Design a protein around this ligand. Structure first.
Ligand code: CHL
Ligand code: CHL
Ligand SMILES: CCCCCCCCCCCCCCCCCC(=O)OC[C@H](CO[C@@H]1O[C@H](CO[C@H]2O[C@H](CO)[C@H](O)[C@H](O)[C@H]2O)[C@H](O)[C@H](O)[C@H]1O)OC(=O)CCCCCCCCCCCCCCCCC
Ligand code: CLA
Ligand code: CLA
Ligand code: CLA
Ligand code: CLA
Ligand SMILES: CCCCCCCCCCCCCCCCCC(=O)OC[C@H](CO[C@@H]1O[C@H](CO)[C@H](O)[C@H](O)[C@H]1O)OC(=O)CCCCCCCCCCCCCCCCC
Ligand SMILES: CCCCCCCCCCCCCCCCCC(=O)OC[C@H](CO)OC(=O)CCCCCCCCCCCCCCCCC
Ligand SMILES: CC1=C(/C=C/C(C)=C/C=C/C(C)=C/C=C/C=C(C)/C=C/C=C(C)/C=C/C2=C(C)CCCC2(C)C)C(C)(C)CCC1
Ligand SMILES: CC1=C(/C=C/C(C)=C/C=C/C(C)=C/C=C/C=C(C)/C=C/C=C(C)/C=C/C2=C(C)CCCC2(C)C)C(C)(C)CCC1
Ligand SMILES: [Cl-]
Ligand SMILES: [Cl-]
Ligand code: NA
Lengths: 32, 449, 35, 243, 61, 44, 76, 36, 37, 336
């Protein structure tokens, strides 16, 4: 369903956000 | 960030690394406040998105919408919801404010100054600076007094709050003439916490609640000014320990007491926690079952005054140990329950016989049947009823959820208070890292323990 | 019963006052630590 | 007087230390004038002299708006609380003298007096008085004397009097002979004037949007904050509940 | 007006996600804060503008 | 009634003080301990 | 040997296991979805707990002919 | 050899474990054994 | 239910309350990335 | 020469040379615990029967009324009293106080105060000896459990008659009725508590067996191996390296506790946190949150209920429920 698909998209986005920030700070310089 | 070698703290105690970093500690605090406001807004938006208008709030697993409804937004007579847009606005305002608080917290955690003492002496502090500690405490006391006065202003001039004791089954009411009498206000704080007394949980009218909030706001503002303009006295300086961990332990004890008290408010109080929004209390549900089985057998022609059970006490009516006419059965233990649907039926001697014979209102009957069927009993997978009931209904009372969660939180914060008070004493005394192995005190003591 | 209540109130008040003023009596100084 | 919060390099700025390092502040703003927060995002100053004449304009607007904010808010509040003032709402005081109408001047606390001067006489008096006063300001010369404190002064005390801050006749209460408190009061004056300019702009926009004066706005908003605000007056009618 | 509000709220969600992923990255990047001042200020300003715009358009939608 | 009892239960009684002599003995005991501690301070 | 963190941080390990592990997961999924789990382990499908003959739970009462008893009380 | 970070590996593994546990808890309310 | 103009954002509303749970796990991720320094 | 009366009293109270430490927590602990001990012993020996259910149907409890050590108990307070705080001076007579369950509230209140001050006294002596202070934190778990069964559960249920009876068979009655009404076995917090006591037994046996296994030879076979240890010896009495090597070869060379301090922290933290969890489970079921209700969870395609082990447990709980307080219920729902 469209509701379940949008919920899954939002869930994947929020779950991947923080790890992406950490990965980007690891590969882009540091200070983490 | 910092490592263990330069701080002496492992990663699982890494927040201790910023005990003496004022700017980073401030950043952690502001980010955390953003987290709290984020949960408030997100949970409020979740509850309004899942809110269904025809069912009552307590049947829908909601804990914040009852709070805003008790404040008196979007509800009418009988606790009926008229509009959920105020709830949506509350959620949106919290969720937006959480972004600003999160930005401030992330800024002060990452790129803000580590210590505020050099460039920002107004905000800079050391934990042993008792004058600055009392200044910060005074600022926060002033803010808390202003919050209590905000509640007072909402109750008096900005639409009032929901009175469950209003005639006809409760309504949103303007509180005129709050109880400002000091004897009445501080009697609550000096009451016993046991049955029939209930300490401050037994506050039963909005006049008493708002008068107590006037007192709390004025006292908080006056004490805030007092702490801004005073320094702790020598007896206090000898009695206390002056360090960040010690202050944290004091706050942990205070909020543990507050969590236990909030547990008891959620479980027992039906005035500040109206049953229209939170469901019946446990005593309310038991008394409602007794009242419903009284009125049913009265409609079946049985005399509910001369009917005695197997023990001989009385199936429907009996006496409290002080002589009041009360409902029979095990709900005798809840004989001190007071609710808006039963207090019209009570005369000076208790449950009035002629009132129970002739003066029963249909709204009282409906609330009693509803509260009997929605007792605060359920499983943690949300199967309503006693442990032996099958998986038919999906219900756990918000009062049950709040009471269980907040007893757990109060207990853990008591334990954390013990941990931090002990560690603060040991660190001030200088043996929080262990026995010196060269100046061991017990080896200098007389034997035989 | 009132005599018993008066006596028990006196006893409890005495022990609680001892507790309170004992921890008020410079208790953080009562340790073998250095500093 | 801690003058270093307003003058010099370590003065207060329009953005804090983490948001604005003291290298983006324009070079023509180096803490030499009152109210210097280093605020010039669009390069409108470009040099000290242009900044100085813009400060002339800014200070004149500041003083006019400081008078205007009180003149807008006070008669409306007096009329609403029960004074015999007509046209208390600032945008409808002009029409009150249209069809030969007159005004009432409430000399506080002494009482309302009927003003006999008609619109033509009022505007002629205003034109001649304001023209003479502005001409005196730009020329640095004035005809007569008798200001308090300085006393009866000849028509030559204006030489050497700094523009935008002429002492002597315009300073009956002294209060500025000490240079430190004079600079500090300059900072106070420019900050109050900027606040009053923003307040007058707010008065205009609020009056246009809501059809009522700022006193009515503040009183009704304090009566009901969540039921009377900008979004509530933009909504128009009562919203359909989302129940 | 409802579609305008929905577009503005979608843009606000996108800008919020960009700020969430980028502001910590810019802050903890080596000399990233002193170089991305304009981008971060533009993001914060457009975020505040979108919040105010959605609040205004709610009274018309 | 067939027997006497204090009947102090419930009623929201301050510190459970149904007779002012109870408040007086509480105040007296606390003040006596405080006075001993006070005239005995600056002695450590 | 190799200290197992070197193993867990090696592209050779991950290019082997991005094939092996999902194949086993899909094998388990197919084992349940194709009914082979029911066939192998004798658990009744949700529609064949009761037959037309018996509408209650089965009861193995014979021991030395329990094989044919469970064959005739099972889902055929 | 260390070409992929161990913390990244552990984070992905924990994400899959949390996802599988969330699937298991979701299956408590749907399908077989869901009281429905 | 949400207001009708905000109804299409109900799917992203339904995910938000778990983000505070995600923050402490993100702290553990960051500590793992600095190798629990 | 520090002649002051309060100073002398304080130096005696905080003295570490007393055989048993008193302290300021002890000046509350000792009288409350002595009161509770005295009343408990006297009541357990010779108390008259107590109408626990408030239905004028008393329960004997004491040895002189025909109980043995197993069946003897101090019976909880009458259900008619509920939570209403019944002390001796609130009774018309000692006979009425005994009939209504006053000794139970007296003992429970004094015991709660005594164990809280016992925890505080543990902290106080650790402070006076220069020790680290968290033995009190460890002792907070049995304190939490006792508070849950004696105070918190009566608070959540509305009556001290729902407190655990001060006895052995009374404890069993409390457990059985608790399972009947709350399904505590299906509660995850109780599962954590069971894991904690079982793991505490496992880890106590494991640690003791490892230390005894790696004991260094200091004695002979005709002498007890304990004689190889002297009180106050500086050197270690066993081989930590050998014990850790055996443990690693036994299960996994990793997932071990070669740090002795980490090992003892684990031994401290596991049963304490699990007893915290199960005490919180009792405290939550006080407010009727209950264990997992899986009754009739499994249905077939046609909707017929397929009974499970949870359903068998439910049958047992039904038998438990329909028999407890056989004369106390007038209405079908057990809401009170
Ligand atoms: C210097 C600034 C100034 C401003 C901002 C306004 C602004 C306004 N005048 Mg106004 N006036 C100003 C000066 C003066 N007016 C008047 C005489 C009038 C009249 C006679 C009227 C206005 C009116 C108005 C309003 C509509 C145009 C408006 C809000 C009209 C009004 O109030 O309509 C309701 C109107 O009828 N003004 C005089 C005297 C000649 C002024 C002298 O300085
Ligand atoms: C010679 C006559 C002359 C007159 C009548 C005025 C009149 C005025 N000038 Mg001006 N000026 C004059 C000459 C000159 N001025 C200037 C330079 C300036 C400047 C730079 C400014 C003025 C301003 C003002 C106004 C405010 C006056 C003041 O002291 O405010 C201060 C206020 C008081 C002293 C209080 C007065 C009110 C109080 C007594 C009322 C209470 C009365 C009781 C009920 C009794 C006013 C309309 C100001 C202006 O336009 O403001 C909008 C302004 O900024 N003048 C120069 C060059 C140095 C002059 C040279 O001759
Ligand atoms: C002396 C101090 C003793 C305190 C503990 C013992 C008593 C606790 C108690 O009886 O608690 C109950 C009381 C509330 O009492 C109830 O208060 C109720 C008030 O409701 C009344 O008023 C309401 C208002 O709407 C309704 O009208 C309602 O119908 C009406 O009956 C009733 O009076 C009940 O009869 C009465 O029992 O809680 C309170 O006073 C709030 C205080 C918080 C208590 C928290 C309990 C746990 C505390 C510590 C746990 C420590 C853990 C760590 C160590 C281990
Ligand atoms: C107001 C709250 C408060 C504050 C501000 C702190 C602050 C401090 N504590 Mg803590 N603490 C508190 C409450 C508080 N605590 C409570 C409630 C307890 C538990 C009983 C303790 C127990 C305690 C211990 C045992 C220790 C600290 C220590 C510390 C320091 C380092 C913390 C750190 O890095 O943790 C980093 C964070 C973690 C490692 C995460 C832990 C994982 C938790 C358990 C997850 C729980 C989630 C769970 C689902 C929540 C619900 C459970 C239940 C309610 C249902 C720091 C100064 C340390 C210290 O003394 O340093 C000087 C130390 O060792 N504290
Ligand atoms: C409530 C959660 C909370 C808060 C607010 C903090 C706050 C803080 N911790 Mg932490 N921490 C936490 C819990 C928390 N922690 C727990 C659960 C643990 C156990 C793992 C620890 C253990 C710990 C250690 C071991 C240490 C700290 C330290 C720090 C401080 C320095 C931050 C830093 O350099 O990280 C750098 C991190 C990054 C660069 C990556 C994360 C980037 C940001 C923060 C992610 C946020 C995303 C967010 C959605 C963006 C919002 C944008 C906004 C516009 C809306 C910081 C003030 C350090 C310290 O004391 O400093 C001296 C330190 O050594 N923490
Ligand atoms: C968040 C609340 C807060 C905090 C944490 C502080 C903290 C402090 N206050 Mg207090 N105070 C506050 C609010 C607060 N206060 C407000 C609201 C007022 C106005 C009434 C005051 C007025 C004030 C005075 C007048 C004094 C302080 C002082 C003190 C210090 C020692 C107090 C002490 O020994 O505690 C222990 C306190 C008590 C044992 C008193 C309890 C009173 C009874 C027992 C309450 C009965 C009800 C209860 C539930 C049972 C301490 C730094 C002292 C100081 O050093 O000032 C310079 C002092 O003399 N306070
Ligand atoms: C507990 C709150 C707290 C505290 C005590 C501080 C303290 C400080 N901040 Mg700030 N900060 C916070 C919150 C806080 N911050 C938040 C939430 C934000 C996001 C907007 C920031 C973002 C921020 C920046 C980006 C900068 C500072 C910096 C500073 C320093 C001086 C400049 C200043 O006052 O900030 C200025 C902040 C403002 C002007 C915001 C408006 C504040 C007004 C006065 C509102 C007052 C509160 C009011 C009662 C409403 C309460 C809201 C509440 C109910 C949620 C000082 C150390 C500066 C620094 O460290 O320089 C190196 C710096 O550059 N802050
Ligand atoms: C762990 C413990 C702390 C955690 C949580 C604490 C929860 C709540 C704390 C506040 C409870 C209410 C406060 C007022 C209590 C009160 O007034 O009691 C007053 C009550 C009322 O007393 C009774 O009142 C009845 C009528 O309501 C009758 O009149 C009875 O005759 C009368 O005895 O008396 C008591 O309960 C005894 C309290 C004595 C406490 C002594 C122990 C304290 C030890 C250390 C304290 C150090 C300081
Ligand atoms: C039921 C009735 C009892 C009511 C209970 C509540 C009563 C109000 C108690 C509030 C006390 C406020 C805290 C003050 C500082 C406490 C620590 C201290 O003391 O620190 C000590 C500090 C050191 O100088 O002293 C000082 O700063 C001066 C502190 C003043 C001490 C107050 C004493 C008031 C009078 C006491 C009774 C009269 C006693 C006489 C009895 C003699 C025999 C009959
Ligand atoms: C320091 C640190 C930390 C912490 C951090 C934090 C805590 C952060 C945060 C933060 C925050 C706290 C944030 C918040 C936010 C918010 C946001 C970002 C928002 C928004 C918005 C929007 C966009 C919305 C929209 C909407 C609406 C309006 C309504 C309807 C629906 C919707 C949803 C659509 C850690 C631990 C990690 C590590 C260490 C360091
Ligand atoms: C709002 C409200 C109200 C009001 C309330 C109030 C008014 C409250 C208060 C209160 C108060 C007013 C309180 C107080 C308190 C106190 C406390 C809580 C304490 C304490 C402390 C401590 C714990 C101490 C300790 C110590 C000692 C003992 C000695 C040594 C040292 C030290 C200091 C450590 C009412 C109910 C009406 C209604 C409803 C709502
Ligand atoms: Cl039983
Ligand atoms: Cl019953
Ligand atoms: Na029964």
């Amino acid at each position: 369903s469209l509701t379940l698909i949008l919920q899954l998209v939002a869930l994947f986005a929020v779950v991947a956000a923080g790890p992406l920030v950490v990965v980007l700070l690891s590969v882009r310089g540091g200070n983490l | 960030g910092r490592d263990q070698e330069t701080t002496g703290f492992a990663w699982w105690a890494g927040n201790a690394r910023l005990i003496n970093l004022s700017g980073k500690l401030l950043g952690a605090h502001v980010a955390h406040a953003g987290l709290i406001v984020f949960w408030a807004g997100a949970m409020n938006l979740f509850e309004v998105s899942h809110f269904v208008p025809e069912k009552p709030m307590y049947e829908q697993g909601l804990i914040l919408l009852p709070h805003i409804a008790t404040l008196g937004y979007g509800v009418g007579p009988g606790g009926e919801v008229l509009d959920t847009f105020p709830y949506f606005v509350s959620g949106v305002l919290h969720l937006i404010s959480s972004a600003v608080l999160g930005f401030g917290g992330v800024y002060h955690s990452l790129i803000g100054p580590e210590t505020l003492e050099e460039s920002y002496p107004f905000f800079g502090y050391v934990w042993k600076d008792k004058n600055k500690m009392t200044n910060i405490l005074g600022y926060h006391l002033i803010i808390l007094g202003c919050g209590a006065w905000l509640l007072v202003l909402k109750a008096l001039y900005f639409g009032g709050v929901y009175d469950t004791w209003a005639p006809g089954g409760g309504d949103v009411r303007i509180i005129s003439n709050p109880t400002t009498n000091a004897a009445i206000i501080f009697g609550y704080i000096v009451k016993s916490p046991f049955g029939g007394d209930g300490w401050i949980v037994s506050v039963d009218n909005l006049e008493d609640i708002i008068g107590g909030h006037i007192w709390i706001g004025t006292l908080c503002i006056l004490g805030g000014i007092w702490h801004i303009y005073t320094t702790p006295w020598p007896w206090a300086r000898r009695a206390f320990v002056w360090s960040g961990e010690a202050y944290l332990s004091y706050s942990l004890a205070a909020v543990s007491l507050m969590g236990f008290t909030a547990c008891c408010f959620a479980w027992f109080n039906n005035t500040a926690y109206p049953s229209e929004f939170y469901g019946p209390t446990g005593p309310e549900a038991s008394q409602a079952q007794a009242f419903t089985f009284l009125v049913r057998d009265q409609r079946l022609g049985a005399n509910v005054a001369s009917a005695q059970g197997p023990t001989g006490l009385g199936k429907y009516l009996m006496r409290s140990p002080t002589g009041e006419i009360i409902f029979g059965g095990e709900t005798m233990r809840f004989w001190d329950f007071r609710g808006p649907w039963v207090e019209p039926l009570r005369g000076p001697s208790g449950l009035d016989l002629v009132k129970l014979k002739n003066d029963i209102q249909p709204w009282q009957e409906r609330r009693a049947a509803e509260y009997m069927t929605h007792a605060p009993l359920g499983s943690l997978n949300s199967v309503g009823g006693v442990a032996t009931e099958i998986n038919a209904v999906n219900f756990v009372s918000p009062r049950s959820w709040l009471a269980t969660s907040h007893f757990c939180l109060g207990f853990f914060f008591f334990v954390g208070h013990l941990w931090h008070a002990g560690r603060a004493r040991a660190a001030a005394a200088g043996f929080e890292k262990g026995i010196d192995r060269v100046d061991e005190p017990v080896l200098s003591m007389r034997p035989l323990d | 019963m009132l005599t018993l209540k008066i006596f028990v109130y006196t006893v409890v008040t005495f022990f609680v006052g001892l507790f309170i003023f004992g921890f008020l009596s410079n208790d953080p100084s009562r340790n073998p630590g250095k500093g | 007087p801690d003058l270093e919060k307003w003058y010099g390099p370590d003065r207060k700025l329009f953005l804090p230390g983490g948001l604005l390092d003291r290298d983006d502040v324009p070079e023509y703003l180096n803490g030499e004038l009152a109210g210097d927060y280093g605020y010039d995002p669009l390069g409108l100053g470009k040099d000290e002299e242009q900044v100085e004449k813009y400060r002339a304009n800014e200070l004149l607007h500041a003083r006019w708006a400081m008078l205007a904010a009180a003149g807008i808010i006070i008669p409306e509040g007096l009329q609403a609380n029960g004074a015999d003032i007509k046209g208390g709402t600032w945008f409808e005081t002009g029409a009150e003298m249209l069809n030969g109408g007159t005004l009432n001047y409430f000399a506080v606390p002494f009482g309302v007096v009927q003003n006999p001067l008609p619109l033509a006489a009022v505007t002629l008096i205003e034109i001649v008085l304001l023209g003479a006063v502005e001409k005196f300001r730009v020329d640095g010369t004035g005809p007569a004397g008798f200001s308090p404190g300085v006393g009866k002064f000849d028509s030559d005390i204006f030489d050497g009097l700094d523009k935008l801050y002429p002492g002597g006749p315009f300073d009956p209460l002294n209060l500025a002979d000490d240079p430190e408190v004079f600079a500090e009061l300059q900072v106070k004056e420019i900050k109050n004037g900027r606040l009053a300019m923003i307040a007058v702009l707010a008065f205009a926009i609020q009056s246009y949007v809501t059809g009522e004066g700022p006193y009515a706005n503040i009183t009704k908003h304090l009566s009901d904050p969540f039921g009377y605000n900008l979004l509530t007056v933009l909504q128009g009618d009562d919203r359909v509940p989302t129940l | 007006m409802t579609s305008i509000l929905q577009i503005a709220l979608l843009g606000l969600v996108l800008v919020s996600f960009a700020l969430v992923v980028g502001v910590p990255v810019v802050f903890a990047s080596p000399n990233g804060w002193t170089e991305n001042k304009g981008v971060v200020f533009s993001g914060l300003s457009v975020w505040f503008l979108l919040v105010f715009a959605v609040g205004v358009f709610n009274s018309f939608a | 009634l067939v027997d006497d009892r204090m009947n102090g239960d419930g009623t929201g009684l301050p510190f459970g003080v149904n007779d002012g002599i109870l408040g007086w003995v509480i105040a007296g005991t606390l003040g006596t301990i405080w006075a001993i501690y006070f005239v005995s301070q600056k002695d450590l | 040997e190799r200290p197992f963190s070197d193993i867990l941080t090696s592209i050779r390990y991950w290019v082997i296991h991005s094939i092996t592990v999902p194949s086993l997961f899909i094998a388990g999924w197919l084992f349940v979805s194709t009914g082979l789990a029911y066939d192998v382990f004798g658990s009744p499908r949700p529609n064949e707990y009761f037959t037309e003959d018996r509408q209650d739970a089965p009861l193995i009462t014979d021991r030395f002919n329990a094989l044919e008893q469970v064959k005739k009380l099972s889902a055929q | 050899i260390g070409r992929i970070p161990l913390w990244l590996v552990g984070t992905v593994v924990g994400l899959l474990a949390i996802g599988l546990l969330a699937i298991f808890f979701y299956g408590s309310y749907v399908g077989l054994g869901s009281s429905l | 239910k949400l207001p009708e103009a905000y109804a299409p954002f109900s799917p992203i509303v339904d995910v938000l309350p778990i983000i505070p749970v995600l923050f402490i796990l993100l702290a553990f991720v960051w500590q793992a990335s600095v190798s629990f320094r | 020469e520090n002649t002051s009366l309060w100073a002398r009293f304080c130096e005696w109270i905080t003295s570490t040379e007393n055989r048993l430490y008193i302290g300021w927590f002890g000046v509350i602990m000792i009288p409350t615990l002595l009161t509770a001990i005295s009343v408990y012993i006297i009541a357990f020996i010779a108390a008259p029967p107590v109408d626990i259910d408030g239905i004028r149907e008393p329960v004997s409890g004491s040895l002189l009324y025909g109980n043995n050590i197993i069946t003897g108990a101090v019976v909880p307070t009458s259900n008619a009293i509920g939570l209403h705080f019944y002390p001796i001076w609130e009774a018309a007579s000692l006979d009425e106080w005994l009939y209504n369950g006053g000794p139970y509230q007296l003992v429970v209140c004094h015991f709660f105060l005594g164990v809280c001050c016992y925890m505080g006294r543990e902290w106080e002596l650790s402070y006076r000896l220069g020790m680290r202070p968290w033995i009190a934190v460890a002792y907070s778990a049995p304190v939490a459990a006792a508070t849950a069964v004696f105070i918190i559960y009566p608070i959540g249920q509305g009556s001290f008659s729902d407190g655990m009876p001060l006895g052995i068979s009374g404890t069993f009655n409390f457990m059985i009725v608790f399972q009947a009404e709350h399904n505590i076995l299906m509660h995850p917090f109780h599962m954590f508590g069971v894991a904690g006591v079982f793991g505490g037994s496992l880890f106590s046996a494991m640690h003791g067996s490892l230390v005894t296994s790696s004991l260094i030879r200091e004695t002979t076979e005709n002498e007890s191996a304990n004689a190889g240890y002297k009180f106050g010896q500086e050197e270690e009495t066993y081989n930590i390296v050998a014990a850790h090597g055996y443990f690693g070869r036994l299960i996994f060379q990793y997932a071990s506790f070669n740090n002795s301090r980490s090992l003892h922290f684990f031994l401290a933290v596991w049963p304490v946190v699990c007893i915290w969890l199960t005490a919180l489970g009792i405290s939550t079921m006080a407010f009727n949150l209950n264990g997992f209700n899986f009754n009739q969870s499994v249905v077939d395609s046609n909707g017929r209920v397929l009974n499970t082990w949870a359903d068998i447990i439910n049958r047992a709980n039904l038998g438990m429920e329909v028999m407890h307080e056989r004369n106390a219920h007038n209405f079908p729902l057990d809401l009170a």
